[PDB]
Amino acid sequence: MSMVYMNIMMAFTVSLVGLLMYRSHLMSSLLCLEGMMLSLFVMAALTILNSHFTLASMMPIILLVFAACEAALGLSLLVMVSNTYGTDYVQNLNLLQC
Amino acid sequence: MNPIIFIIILLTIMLGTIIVMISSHWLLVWIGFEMNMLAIIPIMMKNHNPRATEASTKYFLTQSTASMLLMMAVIINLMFSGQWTVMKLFNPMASMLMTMALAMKLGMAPFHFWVPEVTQGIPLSSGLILLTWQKLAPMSVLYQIFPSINLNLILTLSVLSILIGGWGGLNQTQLRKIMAYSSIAHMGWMTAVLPYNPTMTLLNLIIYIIMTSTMFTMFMANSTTTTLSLSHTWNKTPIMTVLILATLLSMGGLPPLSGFMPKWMIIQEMTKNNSIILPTFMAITALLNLYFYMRLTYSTTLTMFPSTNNMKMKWQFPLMKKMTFLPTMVVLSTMMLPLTPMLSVLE
Amino acid sequence: LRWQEDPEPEDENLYEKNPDSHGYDKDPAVDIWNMRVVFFFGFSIVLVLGSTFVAYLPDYRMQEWARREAERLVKYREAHGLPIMESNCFDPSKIQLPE
Amino acid sequence: MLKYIIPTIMLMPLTWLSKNNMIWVNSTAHSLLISFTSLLLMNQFGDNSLNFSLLFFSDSLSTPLLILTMWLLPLMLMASQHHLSKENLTRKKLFITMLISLQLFLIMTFTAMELILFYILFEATLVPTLIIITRWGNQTERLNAGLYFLFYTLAGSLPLLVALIYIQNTVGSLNFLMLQYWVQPVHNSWSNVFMWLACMMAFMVKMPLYGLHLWLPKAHVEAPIAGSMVLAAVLLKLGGYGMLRITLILNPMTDFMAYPFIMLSLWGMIMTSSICLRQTDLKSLIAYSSVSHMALVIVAILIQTPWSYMGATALMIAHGLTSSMLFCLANSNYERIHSRTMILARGLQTLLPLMATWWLLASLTNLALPPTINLIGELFVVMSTFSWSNITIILMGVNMVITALYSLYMLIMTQRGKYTYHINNISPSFTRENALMSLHILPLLLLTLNPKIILGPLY
Amino acid sequence: ARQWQPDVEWAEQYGGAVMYPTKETAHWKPPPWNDVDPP
Amino acid sequence: LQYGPLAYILGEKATKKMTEKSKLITVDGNICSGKSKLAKEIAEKLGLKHFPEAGIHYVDSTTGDGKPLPVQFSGNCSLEKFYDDPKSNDGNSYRLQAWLYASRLLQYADALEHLLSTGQGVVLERSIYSDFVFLEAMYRQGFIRKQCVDHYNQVKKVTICEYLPPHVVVYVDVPVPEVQSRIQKKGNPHEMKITSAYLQDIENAYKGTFLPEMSEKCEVLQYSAWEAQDAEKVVEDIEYLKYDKGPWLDQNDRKLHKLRMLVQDKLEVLNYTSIPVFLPEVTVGAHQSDQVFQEFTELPGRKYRAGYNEDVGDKWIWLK
Ligand SMILES: CCCCCCCCCCCCCCCCCC(=O)OC[C@H](COP(=O)([O-])OCC(O)COP(=O)([O-])OC[C@@H](COC(=O)CCCCCCCCCCCCCCCCC)OC(=O)CCCCCCCCCCCCCCCCC)OC(=O)CCCCCCCCCCCCCCCCC
Ligand SMILES: CCCCCCCCCCCC(=O)OC[C@H](COP(=O)(O)OCC[N+](C)(C)C)OC(=O)CCCCCCCCCCC
Ligand SMILES: Nc1nc2c(ncn2[C@H]2C[C@H](O)[C@@H](COP(=O)(O)OP(=O)(O)OP(=O)(O)O)O2)c(=O)[nH]1
Ligand SMILES: [Mg+2]
Ligand SMILES: [Zn+2]
């Protein structure tokens, strides 16, 4: 591939592992989710710019617009979780076991 | 919720799924999924209670993670082939993430732990959308990229789904959880025949949607969500118990009902490819599904459970629920075996 | 008692209210007509006519014909010197044995 | 076979559109008429079977089982009138619907030319049978009996479906006429050993084979009277009929694969007869008696001789009439004392002199008294197995002794002796009950005069 | 006799959180009748 | 045009038909407190629809031809037998109270449907918010067991949460000794056995819990027996109420659309009044319930859906 791709590709892996291992806060994981889209944004832009894929120069912007809209929907749920149990801890969200 | 906003949100759930099915570009496929997840959360939060809030959160995190993996597969596929077309992927690593992203969205084992819990925390009408409509979009993509899916991966996810759906359903009394595990079990059949004959993936999907929609509709009519509450139906609407018996027997694959057709055709398309061990193991493990279906038939229609005194006040009012297409769905769920050769319309 | 429930009823003897009862039904009018259809279609038609029908079946399984045919071949093959029954079912002129 | 299928369907509109007090009369009369027309199937030729169309055909093996099937529905309707008296009108007409839909599947099962159409209708009989047991049985154990009856059959049926589809892909067809001319011998290989097991274990669970029979003493005991009659008169013969058909495409592997199943049947034939000597339940005693007779049919089918098949066909018809008769007898006592213990009501010959005459004739046929067709079928199987191995006369002679011991012990326990003092409600025998026994025994004895119509295709 | 139908003891076997009680599954109260929990 | 989402979009909002005189008023008090007269007079003065107190046979008054049905189709519970034998072993004590709550719950829905669909206020007697006073009275005298109280609260807490509380609560107060005197004067052979403690427990329930908890969300007017006779004074007070509290100030067209969709479908209202809690007082066996269901289906004009019974002179069945 190339030398830069290794770190971008390894940055996605770090964020994925970070998202799959919650500690206590729900806000912490949403950041790991928005880190993933940042790595995908940079990785796609590197590919498109280097190959002179002109019409694909708009794709990274579309990736950013939808990923931010999804992030907004994520924060709204976090707020409604905090207004119920007083904190954004994931251990509280355990009613559905039974 | 305002009625007009309810229609608008529903049409956006449909539009998201339609965009996936009419798109020749991976970006529009991804946009289709995003528009679909954005619109379905409000119908899960509509009852405004902690359980709904928890269910919507567990669904968002699962579907958000799945969409990120899918977009990672698309970019890897762009690097190694320089195109966006919705077809076979050109990198084995892209195929694995793509296959795993779709598995998470579908709810296949071992990416299954959210289906019982999300379906339990939302109303019956929201569960009907979740278990029937939300399965169309991922299956459309699998129909198109199956030539490059890793055989050992797709067949391994199929086998686990059949097992975990079977064992999970035995230990349930809540109706919403029983359908959730029933949904996991039937997914394994659809993806087991996919490498061999994708036409039978659609047939099993169509039949599953018809049968599943019939069950949820009958539960919604009597507002029943637990096994016991369903056992009072014989004393309120006797006809509805005979329809539940017939559909439950159909879902179990017992001939001569409709639910035997997909299990019949999938076993045919696998023995043609010299696959004998897998269809037998799949068919035998499906008896677990027939068991906890039969248990509901014993407490609903074949025995008369205890009733309560206040039930007598219900006899004086009719059913004002919509029960849309219930007469048509129930007949299609039971009396379609003589029309099996009609599956060619799906080719 | 754990619940409200009706006591178990008592079995009703059909002889108490109808000593002529045939046992089919409580209503005497139905009880007598039930007996005639059972006894007419059952015995008069199925067993009697069916027994006669089976008795006069037209040569069931061609058994009588085979005996009559066998007597013919015996007459022919016996008054010509030919063996009564050859040991080969098919003529060897058509069989091509390996090597 | 449309001339019989359509009339059977029309019984369903007849039951639901009839007067509320004439459901038992219209149903009984018209089903008897359907039975009378079934005699037209005896147009059997010596060389070619009777081929109606691309879906249905009849030969000498199908005809006796079809005529028996359509002769059993009227008898089931008579036997169900008593205990379905306080039942409400709608549920009574659902009960009759199950019986009719059961006869509809049976007649199409026994005449299906293609072997996958046989599978669908063969499996379709479970649904109506399961509903009768679990919805109209009396005891709390009918629910668990239904589960045992369901999952035992499907555990064997599902492998059978795979085997049949595999045969069509290889052979190219499943038409039974075609298989008679395109059948190829089965090579000895590990794959072919499991093809043999799949094709047979489905039918061994329904005969039933000794070892796989624990559902029979539960289904035949907890079912209503009509359930026991059809269960032990026709439904057991689906497996025997299935074996006689599918053994065409298993030669020569049946030479050595039959050994494990011949020893289970021959020794199981003595375990089941012995169990009858100590059963404390009159209805469960008759159930185990069915396993012993059907063990003879398994041996007869697996050795594949002209005499064995003629004996096997005769035994199946003889057992169906004799076993269904015994259940009716045990039911008449139950409808009076409402209990199944055999040692509860004794000396009944003093109070019901005629009903004890039916008991005597039923037991004589059960223990194969000549010249009954019970004896003709059993004798031919004994003759055939002697050629197979002369030592088998030892086992088939010991079972004869035990068979007469439990047949007459049941007769002596309930008919002879001294009557129970505190049981005082033994009312005389209704004409309905006496006619029910006369419709079982008279055809059974008449067949002795012209027994060639129940000897099957190899006569 | 009369056809047996389930009584309260039989029906309570299906009114628990799970069909097969174990050590872990003890204390699992059945969900609220209307999916609403206290605030 | 049956009310539904389509009609609401077409214009059938609730605020378009509700005014400042569209109020729900509940008159509460002890036994023989004259609330029947006071409530019936507030209705005519304000032009409100009056709902007679929901009894054992209220549901029958709304369905069918309107006449009461035999007592075997209403649980076999009798109010007369409660006074004579409050300690009966057949459970008629609590079985009566559980059925009464369902009738009150059924009526409180009819009250809201009339108000929300026509804009006309209604006056009720002992709504579901006050039915717990009798429960406390029975429990403290040993009439019903503690399990029955638990069952009552479980059903109440999943039903009462779906409805708005009354705008105005009018409480007629009578000292316990005087009430017991009026019972004797009336002369009911059965009601005369009401002991002093039973009437005192109701008073404590009203004073201790009902009124204090019912004033944080309603305009509560309290009157004595003497004052209650002046209707125009009570009606004058109801017309000068501020209405500055309660959850009615947070309602809009969207929120009231959902409520009307609920109180018009009566099987959804009565849904949780039959929860599968196997309690001997309110449980029925399979053989008994099946038999009663068949008889209920043989009554005139009740074998089919209202409008399709040929025996009550319905027509055009083959086109409806
Ligand atoms: C069998 C294998 C399949 C398994 C099926 C499993 C279900 C079996 C049901 C029986 C066992 C259930 C357990 C019994 C205990 C629970 C019963 C109970 O307590 O409540 C009684 C229950 C409650 O009624 P109720 O409120 O208490 O009082 C009734 C009133 O007095 C109202 O009374 P009404 O005076 O106003 O009239 C009543 C009305 C009844 O109202 C209806 O609901 C009619 C619905 C009919 C649609 C389904 C017909 C499909 C079968 C075709 C039948 C016609 C045959 C062709 C003859 C015409 C030739 C063109 O009857 C009629 O007017 C004419 C109907 C004639 C048909 C008889 C209906 C029963 C058929 C189902 C039995 C199985 C048939 C298998 C046939 C397959 C072999 C060919 O009674 C019923 O209404 C239930 C009967 C209707 C059930 C419909 C089930 C449809 C789904 C079955 C699909 C079959 C698939 C077969 C494979 C097809 C392959 C091509
Ligand atoms: C062709 C493939 C199959 C399609 C299946 C048929 C369609 C689905 C079923 C019918 C749905 C239905 O009618 O929804 C339920 C209700 C019907 O009003 P109701 O009060 O419930 O009944 C009324 C009739 N009655 C009581 C007499 C029986 O409709 C509605 O709320 C209609 C809302 C329309 C407003 C549109 C807003 C703008 C949307 C566009 C924004 C860009
Ligand atoms: N167990 C029980 N009895 C009740 C309940 N409400 C009323 N009752 C009884 C008490 C009375 O004996 C009878 C009617 O009570 P009322 O409240 O109507 O008082 P009364 O009729 O004597 O005069 P009034 O209506 O106030 O003018 O029914 C209740 O919620 N539970
Ligand atoms: Mg009063
Ligand atoms: Zn009896």
CSV table of N, CA and C in Angstrom, one decimal, chain D residues 273-288 326 329-330 333-334 337-348 359 363 405-420 423:
chain,number,residue,atom,x,y,z
D,273,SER,N,-44.9,-59.4,24.3
D,273,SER,CA,-46.0,-60.4,24.7
D,273,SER,C,-45.9,-60.6,26.2
D,274,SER,N,-44.7,-60.7,26.8
D,274,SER,CA,-44.6,-60.9,28.2
D,274,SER,C,-45.1,-59.8,29.0
D,275,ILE,N,-44.8,-58.5,28.5
D,275,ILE,CA,-45.2,-57.3,29.3
D,275,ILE,C,-46.7,-57.3,29.4
D,276,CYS,N,-47.5,-58.0,28.5
D,276,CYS,CA,-48.9,-58.0,28.6
D,276,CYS,C,-49.4,-58.9,29.7
D,277,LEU,N,-48.6,-59.8,30.2
D,277,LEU,CA,-49.0,-60.7,31.3
D,277,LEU,C,-49.1,-60.0,32.6
D,278,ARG,N,-48.5,-58.8,32.8
D,278,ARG,CA,-48.5,-58.1,34.0
D,278,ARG,C,-49.1,-56.6,34.0
D,279,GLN,N,-49.5,-56.2,32.8
D,279,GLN,CA,-50.1,-54.9,32.7
D,279,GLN,C,-51.3,-54.7,33.6
D,280,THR,N,-51.4,-53.7,34.4
D,280,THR,CA,-52.5,-53.4,35.3
D,280,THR,C,-53.6,-52.5,34.6
D,281,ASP,N,-53.4,-52.2,33.4
D,281,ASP,CA,-54.3,-51.3,32.6
D,281,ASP,C,-54.8,-52.0,31.4
D,282,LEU,N,-56.1,-52.1,31.3
D,282,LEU,CA,-56.7,-52.9,30.2
D,282,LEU,C,-56.4,-52.3,28.8
D,283,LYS,N,-56.4,-50.9,28.8
D,283,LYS,CA,-56.2,-50.3,27.5
D,283,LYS,C,-54.7,-50.3,27.1
D,284,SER,N,-53.8,-50.2,28.1
D,284,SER,CA,-52.4,-50.3,27.9
D,284,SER,C,-52.0,-51.8,27.5
D,285,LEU,N,-52.7,-52.7,28.0
D,285,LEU,CA,-52.5,-54.1,27.6
D,285,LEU,C,-52.7,-54.3,26.1
D,286,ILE,N,-53.7,-53.8,25.6
D,286,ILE,CA,-54.0,-53.9,24.1
D,286,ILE,C,-53.0,-53.2,23.3
D,287,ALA,N,-52.4,-52.1,23.8
D,287,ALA,CA,-51.4,-51.3,23.1
D,287,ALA,C,-50.2,-52.1,22.9
D,288,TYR,N,-49.6,-52.7,24.0
D,288,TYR,CA,-48.4,-53.5,23.8
D,288,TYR,C,-48.7,-54.7,22.9
D,326,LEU,N,-60.7,-54.6,19.9
D,326,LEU,CA,-60.4,-54.7,21.3
D,326,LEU,C,-60.5,-53.4,22.0
D,329,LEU,N,-64.0,-52.7,22.8
D,329,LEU,CA,-64.5,-53.5,23.9
D,329,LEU,C,-64.0,-52.9,25.2
D,330,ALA,N,-62.7,-52.5,25.3
D,330,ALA,CA,-62.2,-51.9,26.5
D,330,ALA,C,-62.9,-50.6,26.8
D,333,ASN,N,-66.5,-50.9,28.6
D,333,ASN,CA,-66.4,-51.0,30.1
D,333,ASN,C,-66.0,-49.6,30.7
D,334,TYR,N,-65.1,-48.9,30.0
D,334,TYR,CA,-64.7,-47.6,30.6
D,334,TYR,C,-65.9,-46.6,30.6
D,337,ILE,N,-67.8,-47.7,34.1
D,337,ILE,CA,-67.1,-47.5,35.3
D,337,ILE,C,-66.0,-46.4,35.3
D,338,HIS,N,-65.8,-45.8,34.1
D,338,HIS,CA,-64.9,-44.6,34.0
D,338,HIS,C,-63.6,-44.9,34.7
D,339,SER,N,-63.0,-46.0,34.4
D,339,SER,CA,-61.6,-46.3,34.9
D,339,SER,C,-61.0,-47.4,34.1
D,340,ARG,N,-59.7,-47.4,34.0
D,340,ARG,CA,-59.0,-48.3,33.1
D,340,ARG,C,-58.3,-49.4,33.7
D,341,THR,N,-58.3,-49.5,35.1
D,341,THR,CA,-57.7,-50.6,35.8
D,341,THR,C,-58.5,-51.9,35.4
D,342,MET,N,-57.7,-52.9,35.1
D,342,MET,CA,-58.3,-54.2,34.6
D,342,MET,C,-58.9,-55.0,35.7
D,343,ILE,N,-58.4,-54.9,36.9
D,343,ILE,CA,-58.9,-55.7,38.0
D,343,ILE,C,-60.0,-55.0,38.8
D,344,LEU,N,-60.7,-54.0,38.2
D,344,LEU,CA,-61.7,-53.2,38.9
D,344,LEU,C,-63.1,-53.8,38.7
D,345,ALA,N,-63.5,-54.1,37.5
D,345,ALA,CA,-64.8,-54.7,37.1
D,345,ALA,C,-64.5,-56.1,36.6
D,346,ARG,N,-65.0,-57.1,37.4
D,346,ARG,CA,-64.8,-58.5,37.1
D,346,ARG,C,-66.1,-59.2,36.9
D,347,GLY,N,-66.0,-60.4,36.4
D,347,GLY,CA,-67.2,-61.2,36.2
D,347,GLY,C,-68.3,-60.6,35.4
D,348,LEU,N,-67.9,-59.8,34.4
D,348,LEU,CA,-68.9,-59.0,33.6
D,348,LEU,C,-69.7,-60.0,32.7
D,359,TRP,N,-66.2,-60.5,23.3
D,359,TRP,CA,-64.9,-60.7,23.9
D,359,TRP,C,-64.2,-62.0,23.5
D,363,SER,N,-60.7,-62.4,21.2
D,363,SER,CA,-59.5,-63.0,21.7
D,363,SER,C,-59.1,-64.2,20.8
D,405,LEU,N,-51.6,-66.8,26.2
D,405,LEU,CA,-51.6,-66.6,27.7
D,405,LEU,C,-52.2,-65.3,28.1
D,406,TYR,N,-51.8,-64.2,27.4
D,406,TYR,CA,-52.3,-62.9,27.7
D,406,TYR,C,-53.6,-62.6,27.1
D,407,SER,N,-53.9,-63.2,25.9
D,407,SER,CA,-55.2,-63.1,25.3
D,407,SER,C,-56.3,-63.6,26.2
D,408,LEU,N,-56.1,-64.8,26.7
D,408,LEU,CA,-57.1,-65.4,27.6
D,408,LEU,C,-57.1,-65.0,29.0
D,409,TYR,N,-55.9,-64.5,29.5
D,409,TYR,CA,-55.8,-63.9,30.8
D,409,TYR,C,-56.7,-62.7,30.9
D,410,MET,N,-56.6,-61.8,29.9
D,410,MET,CA,-57.5,-60.7,29.8
D,410,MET,C,-59.0,-61.1,29.8
D,411,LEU,N,-59.3,-62.1,29.0
D,411,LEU,CA,-60.7,-62.6,28.9
D,411,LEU,C,-61.1,-63.1,30.3
D,412,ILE,N,-60.3,-63.9,31.0
D,412,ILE,CA,-60.7,-64.5,32.2
D,412,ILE,C,-60.8,-63.4,33.3
D,413,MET,N,-59.9,-62.4,33.3
D,413,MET,CA,-59.9,-61.5,34.4
D,413,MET,C,-61.1,-60.6,34.5
D,414,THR,N,-61.7,-60.2,33.3
D,414,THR,CA,-62.8,-59.3,33.2
D,414,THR,C,-64.1,-60.0,33.0
D,415,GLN,N,-64.2,-61.1,32.4
D,415,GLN,CA,-65.4,-61.8,32.1
D,415,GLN,C,-65.8,-62.9,33.0
D,416,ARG,N,-64.8,-63.7,33.4
D,416,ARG,CA,-65.0,-64.8,34.3
D,416,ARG,C,-64.9,-64.4,35.8
D,417,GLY,N,-64.8,-65.3,36.7
D,417,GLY,CA,-64.6,-64.9,38.1
D,417,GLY,C,-65.9,-64.6,38.8
D,418,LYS,N,-65.8,-63.6,39.7
D,418,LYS,CA,-67.0,-63.1,40.5
D,418,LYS,C,-67.1,-61.6,40.3
D,419,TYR,N,-68.3,-61.1,40.2
D,419,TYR,CA,-68.5,-59.7,40.0
D,419,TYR,C,-68.2,-58.9,41.2
D,420,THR,N,-67.7,-57.6,40.9
D,420,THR,CA,-67.5,-56.7,42.0
D,420,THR,C,-68.8,-56.3,42.7
D,423,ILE,N,-69.7,-52.2,42.5
D,423,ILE,CA,-69.9,-51.7,41.2
D,423,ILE,C,-71.3,-52.1,40.8
